[PDB]
Structure formats: C-alpha cells, structure tokens
Enzyme design. Structure first.
Site, PDB file in Angstrom:
ATOM      1  N   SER B 248       0.863  -1.175   0.000  1.00 53.52           N
ATOM      2  CA  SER B 248       0.000   0.000   0.000  1.00 53.52           C
ATOM      3  C   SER B 248       0.900   1.226   0.000  1.00 53.52           C
ATOM      4  CB  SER B 248      -0.933   0.007   1.209  1.00 53.52           C
ATOM      5  OG  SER B 248      -1.720   1.186   1.238  1.00 53.52           O
ATOM      6  N   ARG B 249       0.905   1.960  -1.117  1.00 53.44           N
ATOM      7  CA  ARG B 249       1.777   3.124  -1.230  1.00 53.44           C
ATOM      8  C   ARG B 249       1.436   4.172  -0.180  1.00 53.44           C
ATOM      9  NH1 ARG B 249       2.286   2.313  -6.848  1.00 53.44           N
ATOM     10  NH2 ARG B 249       0.064   1.785  -6.687  1.00 53.44           N
ATOM     11  N   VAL B 250       0.150   4.390   0.068  1.00 48.24           N
ATOM     12  CA  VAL B 250      -0.302   5.343   1.067  1.00 48.24           C
ATOM     13  C   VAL B 250      -0.977   4.563   2.187  1.00 48.24           C
ATOM     14  CG1 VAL B 250      -2.598   5.776   0.104  1.00 48.24           C
ATOM     15  CG2 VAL B 250      -1.405   7.608   1.382  1.00 48.24           C
TER      16      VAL B 250
END
Ligand SMILES: Nc1ncnc2c1ncn2[C@@H]1O[C@H](COP(=O)(O)OP(=O)(O)OP(=O)(O)O)[C@@H](O)[C@H]1O
Ligand SMILES: [Mg+2]
Lengths: 55, 388, 234, 48, 55, 232
Positions: B248-250
């Site tokens: 999950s990038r963010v």
C-alpha cells in the site's frame, strides 16, 4: 558430606516446590474470580445495550 | 435529494493526505497493508479466493468507528448477494451499510452505472454526511466488488453500440471509465469538509495473471494492492495474502502509531522468512539463527491465519503482535498458535479488559509500549502463559 | 516551458504519463469517427507524438532538461504508444514487473535501459568501461537464466559461477533507499554520487566484496555502506 | 510470444523433463546396487 | 540419583501445580460463560417484551 | 422445470455441454452482425449467460439444482467461456480416465473436484475436517506415487507406508453400488447419508479398518458394511 547436603537440598527444593505450588494455585484463584466478575460485568453491560437498542 | 452520478472528481487542491486509519480486523491486512480513510486499495485475487470475504469482514469490523460501509455488487449471482446480505444482517452491520445489487441476470445497462451510483452515495457521505449513532459521520467505505464484470458489461454495451474495440476487445475508454469511477473516492481537506471515502475495488484474474489489461489498469489507478494467492488459500492460510508483493503506497503514515510500531519488525521478520523459504528444504544444514528465523516466520504466518467472521479490535491486534514479535511465543508449537491466540484474546476480554482500554486510548502516542502499557501487557501475557 | 526556454533560463521539465495523453487521443479519435489503428489507437498517433515531443527540445537560446514518464499497457512493451515514445528519447529507462516484485523498488532493468550520452568522451572512460562491464554481467545472467532455472547452479563453470554470483550481487546492489520512500519503508534515503557509484561498481567487479553475502547489497548506497554492514555483521 | 515459438519452447522443455525423468530413475537404479555393494563390503571392513 | 530425584520431584510437583491452576481456572471460566450465556439469553427476552409493549 | 419448482418440488436439471450453448449464442450473435468479443465470442456473453443459470436458485417454495456438463476449449480454464461458466458454479466434479480404468464406476477425482459449500459454517466442523484430512492424505498419495514408481514402497518411511496403504484403501472405498446399475452388476445400490458418510470416513481415518485389506472396501457402502463383509 555431599550425600547429606544433597538430601538436605532435595528437602529444600521439594519444600520450595510446595511453596512455589502455593502461589501458583493461589494466583489462579483471583484470576478465576476476577475473570468471573468481568464476564458477568461484560454480560450485564451488553444486557443494557440490548435493552436500550430495543427501546 | 438526489446526487448526479457521472460527475467529475472534486479535484487535486480539494484533497489532503490520509491520516485516519481504517481497522479491517484482519491481522495481515491491518499489519502489513495499512488502510487509511479516503485511500484507494485494491483487493485482487483468483476467482474463489476470499476477496468478498475480506470485504465483508472489513464491513463487519466498522460497527463502532463512525463508518459508512457501501457494498456494490456487479454481475454477482442472486444467491451470492442474498448470502452477503444475510451475513450482514446476522452480525447487525446491516444497520449502517447500503447494498446496491447489479446482478448477472440484469441488463448490461445495469452493472455499468451501479458502481457509479455507489460512488454517488459515497460522495453524498463525503459532503453532506449522515446521522449515525447520534453523531454526524462523513467517512464512508465503498466496496465495488468485481470490477472485471463491470468492464465486461461496459464492453458489451460498447460493442452493441458498434464502437471500435481495443486491447482484449475492450473499448479504448475503459481506463477512463474506471478512472472516473474511482478517482472520486478521496480524502478531502478541512476547508471542503474533511470527509473520506476509502475504495476497495475487487478484480477477478485468471490463473494468477496480474498482467491482464483491467488488472493492470486498476493497479495503476489505485494506491495499493492486496494480491490474494490461490495456492496460499488452498494451503490452508485462508486470509491468503502475497505479503512479498502486496503493498500500500499510502496509509503507512495513516496508521495507528502502536500498530506500525509493532508491525515494522513483523514485516522485517516475515521478509526474512520469505528469503529463507528457499533454504527451508535443507534438513540439519541450517544454523541456529536460520532455523530460529524459519520457526519465527512459520509462527507469524500461522498467526496471520484468521478465521472468517471473526473481526479483531485494533487493541487486540497490537497486543497479539507485541506478544508474537517479542519472542514470547517461541515456546508455542506452530499448529496450536491459532487456538492460543483465541484463548489469549478471550483472556484479555475476561481478565484484563482494562489493559485493552488502556491500549485503546494510548494508541495515539508516538511510542506504543509506554512503560505502564508495556509492563501491564507483559504481566498479562506472563499470567496467561502461567494459566496455559 | 517554451517561454522560459526562449529567454535562456534553464528549465527542468517533468512531464508525467504521456501514455495518458496518447490514450486520451485514442479515445477522442474513436469518438471522432476515425478508424482505429492497431489496438484501437488513433491513426494519427505518430503525428501527435511528434507534435508534442518535438516541442521538448533544448535550443541554442535555452535548454530544457526534461524527464518523461510512460505507462505501458498491461506489461506489453510492444504497444504502439511506448514504441512511438522509444524513438523520441536520448536515455531510455525500462521498469520491469519482475524486478519490482523482487523487492527491487528502483526496478530499473539495466539490460533494457540505454542512454545516448553513455560515451567515454562525455561521461568518462572509467564510467563507460564500468557500465559496459555491468551490462555484460547480467547479460551472461540473462543468457544463463534457463540453465540456472532447470539444471541448477552446479552445472555452470567456475568462471560462469563467478559471473552469476557477481551478477546477482550487482542486481541486488542496484537497489537503493529513497528519501521519499520513508512513508512505507523504514530505510533512510541515500544519495550516492555518480563517482561513488562508479567506484563501488568497479570495486565489486574487481573482486572486492565477493566473499560478502549477497543479501548485504540490498537497501544500500555505495560499497562503503555494504562493507560497514558486513563488518557490523562480523 | 508468437503462439508458435512458445510451442517449440513447450516441446523442448517437455523433452527436458522426459530426459531428466529417465535420468532420475537410472541413477536410482544404480543407487540401489551401490547401496547393495556397500552392504556386501561391510562384513569385510567390520570383521577386520 | 538423589540429585536426579530432586530435579524430577521439583518438576513433577510444579507440573502438577500448573495443572491444578489450569483446571480450577477452567472451572471458573466455564461456570462464568454459561452465566453470561444465561444473562445474554435473559437480556434478549426482556428486549423481546419491549417490542411487544411497542406493538 | 419452473412449473415443477413452483409446486415446491426439488428439481435436478442436467445440461449437456453448456459450452455448446455458449458457442450457439456466439454463432447467433455473429449471424446477427454483432461485434466479436475477445475470442470472437458474442459480445453479450455475461448477459446471455445471466439470463440463463440464474433461474436455477433455491427459492422459498422450491429449489432447482443444476448438473451441467462443461467442455473446456482446448485446455484453457482461462478462456472466456469456461471462466464465465466458473463464475456461476458452486461445486466442481472432474471424472478422470484412469480412475475409471480400474473398475471404480464413481470415478470422481478427489483433488480436482472441489466445492464452495465445503466449509465448517455449512456442512459442519466434522465434515470439513474429515474432507480436509482425506484431501491431505490423497495429496500425499499422489506425491509419493513418483517415489514408489522410482524406488518402490520399501523406501517409504514408517507412518508413511501407512498413509499410502490407507489412501489405497480409502480410494477403493470410494466405490459405491448404484440402484440403476443393479441389473448390470447384480449388486443392489446403497444410499449413504452424508452423516453416515462422514462418520464412516472418520472411522476409517482414525485407525479402524486398518487390519482390513484393500479389498472388502470395494463396491461397498458404510463402514458397518465393510466390517460385516470382513467378519464373514
Ligand atoms: N478466513 C476464512 N476462513 C474460512 N473460509 C474462508 C475465509 N475466507 C474465505 N473463506 C471461504 O472462501 C470461499 C470464497 O470466499 P469469497 O466469496 O470471499 O471469494 P472471492 O475470492 O471473493 O470470490 P467469489 O466471489 O468468486 O467467491 C467461501 O467458501 C468462504 O467461506
Ligand atoms: Mg467471493
């Protein structure tokens, strides 16, 4: 001499084991009771929640 | 009032970085793939793998979080939708969720605007908000379910409109379709309300082909991905998560400080386990360090295995992870770890719920194992091990 | 950008996902009644790509230093849009899904990445030689991929084994933490000067660090960091 | 990736599995006699 | 053998003690949950009356 | 079938080669002039298949269960037709040539045949546990067929030769007499209830019947039947 103290140490350890067994049995008791009280408390606070949601 | 579907997303300036986490209740999801309110995370899998199960578990967990779940079914059979709605009704989560049904028997016009309608309800929650549990809530969770069938329906509509097909016979604007669908899910800044709309699209792949057109498109547009391995699901690990490649990038910053504080070394140790997976074939050829790492990794992956319809509170999550990642479970044999965790969470719910509430209201501090919460937790785990 | 370029000011251009531009062109052309070309793309893909890209040129009045971003549909590098972009670049960088899933976040494929300025007259003889060696290494690895996959490591020759080990060490050493990656990675960002990178790669190719395990090359900067980590590991 | 070159790859690798399948069992057959020879030689070494 | 006997007896008594502690705690836990089950069953019934008053 | 379902009766629907229905729909769409879809298939694949196969549900009045044969084009489970068929499937059965080569008429391949409803929440914890144990031991059986063919059964370690023997016994136990085959085989069919089946397989797995050879399990019903046969 080694036999005498080892026999003495065995008596001390077996007495210590009984001493150790004393609180281990003891600590179970309040853990038994304190779990019981919260379980009733958890059931009760859920009980009013079921009642208030019904109203 | 009615909200017009097929509208432009709020925009760039009308946004803020996500900060408030979403408690999914799954050990692996909440530990390695943090989810924040207003983010866009992908749940992708291979047919019957558990994507719908993960979505419904997340919906169930959001009972007291001031959360507005949205579940939109695309092309699903009537039996599956009925089972899902019955499951939601059983756990009482149905009171705060809206289900939009676009089933397979329905026309191709449906399953094409149904996700857009769900997004419209999500945007209404964004801006106006609704009254839930006596408080105004402006944060909504939306699950679009299987978007592959949505793309199939759109392709059918386009071909029936005699539009030129593109890659995989898909219309060339299908990327625009999904982009305009999902871009509206955002985390607004304070001056536009501060609401959030976390999106959980679901993609059905074929033979673990993450290189297909629609899967790659949705991976590109979304912020994070949750790859559900079919082999892992068949192996018995029901929350089958490809921890090596799912990311999950963010949301890493949009995670409770305790959760990340106890999950960083969890991720490190599980990475070591994955690296040592090749060396696990050798017998007696591994030193103490490698064997200990393999045992720890097996323990943690069995810990991640969580049965369906069993959401776990975030305080229980962090307590269990602190127990597992501080060498306190090295003595426990692997096959019994799941029942050990069940017994331990029962112990905390019965013996020391005060520890649980202390963790809950101390989760916002920078350091999770505050002397009192750490000590208290160590005393509780030692007592439980003594009882065991 | 053109106004500032014409007045002589240096311009750092960052155009992002030109593939989205060409995809929007394809969609509008399909809506316009034009025939689809290749996979549904606009017939005037080359003309539009030239019209946009040729405006990105460093001139005698001023220079534009531009980075472009391109999204490849699925994972097909033979798609018309990336193929058209390929001819409008001085330096090409290819990111591969396999390298990304191998935890190599930079994910740049050395064999599929080239640069026009890679000239010993321009970049330096030592840099050029190091780059050529670092390409021939992992070129041997790409050649031996099938053999290592099927037969195993033992079937290779001693020099082949050394080349394969150095290739894997190099591909792991290509990983580098980023200052903007602190959101999801605890590894602090590292800024490695080009001279430091050349020195590290030359030292690795010479044979230094061969005894070092390959895992110590991951999330590292220059060779000095790897040596320090190995010494800490004792 | 031309739907025919991969077919040649499939045929070649399928041959490799068949060859290695023969290789796996012939060594096993020689493994059985090598272990048998070890057992037969054991009394000579053990007795002395 | 006496030292070996001391080690065995020390562990045997401790093992017995930890067994007894687990046993009695199990009795309290099982006794409490059925009481909680009774209360939860009781809580549901009073809610059942509440809707009947509403009807 | 809907008339009978409206009467509260339970209806078994048998469709022969639903893939032929898919290709018929594809040809109909092609003749109508609609654009081809992803194989040259009909653009209305999902809609056409959803108009079908969706009336096959368990209603309050009655239930219709459909048993549909499927032909896989070439060998592609990722082809749009079989994938779409799988999209509306709840259980799978894969009859296999070699299993029927040996005279086991119910030649169901246990590994290939799966079902969505095989979960503790529906069939019960005991059923799921015994099914998983049977699958695990059979998987070990097919894994060790390679070693058995290479070196023989003697190389199998202890507690493992037990597993292969039990797997052979249980796979011969999979045979069951059929009332429709009574006249052909001269053997009356046996209807084994699901609870009886689960109990018999659990009592086979736990250790009972190990002394009984691979025979006396063939063409049998419950574990009581095999015990009775062994006694006589
Ligand atoms: N944690 C779990 N524990 C037990 N069973 C699980 C778990 N997660 C999923 N399952 C089971 O897996 C099966 C598939 O679940 P689910 O419906 O979520 O699949 P999916 O991957 O979303 O796709 P599909 O909608 O095509 O079935 C169901 O039988 C469900 O009970
Ligand atoms: Mg599902």
């Amino acid at each position: 001499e080694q036999l005498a103290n080892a026999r003495r140490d065995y008596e001390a350890e077996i007495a210590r084991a009984r001493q150790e067994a004393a609180k281990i049995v003891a600590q179970a008791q309040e853990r038994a009771k304190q779990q019981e009280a919260e379980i009733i408390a958890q059931a009760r606070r859920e009980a009013e929640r079921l009642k208030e949601e019904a109203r | 009032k009615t909200r017009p579907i097929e509208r432009i997303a709020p925009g760039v300036i009308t946004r803020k970085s996500v900060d408030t986490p979403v408690q999914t209740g799954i050990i692996a999801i909440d530990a390695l793939i943090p989810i924040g309110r207003g983010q866009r995370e992908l749940i992708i899998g291979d047919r019957q793998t558990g994507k719908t199960a993960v979505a419904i578990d997340t919906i169930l967990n959001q009972k007291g979080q001031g959360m507005v779940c949205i579940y939109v079914a695309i092309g699903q059979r009537r039996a599956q939708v009925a089972q899902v709605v019955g499951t939601l009704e059983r756990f009482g989560a149905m009171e705060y969720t809206i289900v939009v049904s676009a089933t397979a028997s329905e026309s191709a016009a449906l399953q094409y605007i149904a996700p857009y309608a769900g997004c419209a309800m999500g945007e209404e929650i964004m801006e106006n908000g609704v009254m839930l549990n006596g408080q105004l809530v402006k944060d909504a969770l939306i699950v679009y379910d299987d978007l592959s069938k949505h793309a199939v329906a759109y392709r059918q509509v386009s071909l029936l409109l005699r539009r030129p097909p593109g890659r995989e016979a898909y219309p060339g604007d299908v990327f625009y379709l999904h982009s305009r669908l999902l871009e509206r899910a955002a985390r607004l800044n304070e001056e536009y309300g501060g609401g959030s709309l976390t999106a959980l699209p679901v993609i059905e792949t074929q033979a673990n082909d993450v290189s297909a057109y629609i899967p790659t498109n949705v991976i590109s547009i979304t912020d994070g991905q949750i790859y559900l391995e079919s082999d892992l699901f068949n192996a018995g690990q029901r929350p089958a998560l490809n921890v090596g490649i799912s990311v999950s990038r963010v949301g890493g910053a949009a995670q409770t400080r305790a959760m990340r504080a106890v999950a960083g070394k969890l991720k490190g140790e599980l990475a070591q386990f994955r690296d040592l997976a090749a060396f696990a074939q050798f017998a007696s050829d591994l030193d103490a360090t490698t064997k200990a790492q393999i045992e720890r990794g097996q323990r943690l992956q069995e810990l991640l295995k969580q049965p369906q319809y069993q959401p776990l509170p975030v305080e229980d999550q962090v307590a269990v992870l602190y127990a597992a990642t501080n060498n306190y479970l090295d003595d426990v044999p692997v096959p019994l770890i799941t029942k050990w965790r069940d017994d331990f969470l029962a112990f905390l719910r019965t013996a020391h719920p005060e520890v649980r509430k202390l963790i809950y209201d101390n989760r916002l501090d920078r350091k999770f194992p505050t002397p009192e919460v750490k000590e208290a937790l160590e005393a509780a785990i030692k007592e439980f091990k003594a009882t065991s | 950008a053109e106004y500032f370029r014409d007045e002589g000011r240096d311009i750092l251009l960052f155009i992002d996902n030109i593939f989205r531009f060409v995809q929007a062109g394809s969609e509008v052309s399909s809506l316009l009644g034009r025939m689809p070309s290749q996979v549904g793309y606009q017939p005037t893909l080359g003309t539009e790509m030239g019209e946009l890209q040729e405006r990105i040129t460093s001139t005698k009045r001023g220079s534009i230093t531009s980075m472009q971003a391109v999204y490849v549909p699925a994972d097909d590098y033979t798609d018309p849009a990336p193929a058209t972009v390929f001819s409008h670049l001085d330096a090409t960088i290819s990111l591969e899904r396999s390298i990304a899933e191998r935890a190599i976040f930079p994910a740049v494929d050395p064999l599929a990445s080239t640069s026009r300025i890679l000239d010993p007259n321009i970049v330096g003889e030592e840099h050029y030689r190091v780059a050529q060696e670092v390409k021939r290494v992992l070129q041997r690895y790409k050649d031996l991929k099938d053999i290592i996959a099927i037969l195993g490591m033992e079937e290779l020759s001693d020099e082949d084994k050394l080349t394969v080990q150095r290739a894997r060490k190099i591909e792991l050493f290509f990983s580098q933490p980023f200052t903007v990656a602190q959101q999801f990675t605890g590894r602090p960002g590292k800024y490695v000067p080009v001279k430091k990178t050349v020195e590290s790669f030359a030292r690795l190719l010479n044979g230094e660090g061969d005894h070092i395990p390959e895992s110590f090359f991951y999330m590292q900067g220059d060779f000095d960091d790897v040596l320090a980590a190995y010494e800490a590991s004792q | 990736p031309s739907s025919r070159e991969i077919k040649r790859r499939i045929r070649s690798v399928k041959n490799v599995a068949q060859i290695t399948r023969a290789m796996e069992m012939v060594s096993a057959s020689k493994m059985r006699r090598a272990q048998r020879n070890v057992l037969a030689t054991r009394p000579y070494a053990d007795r002395m």
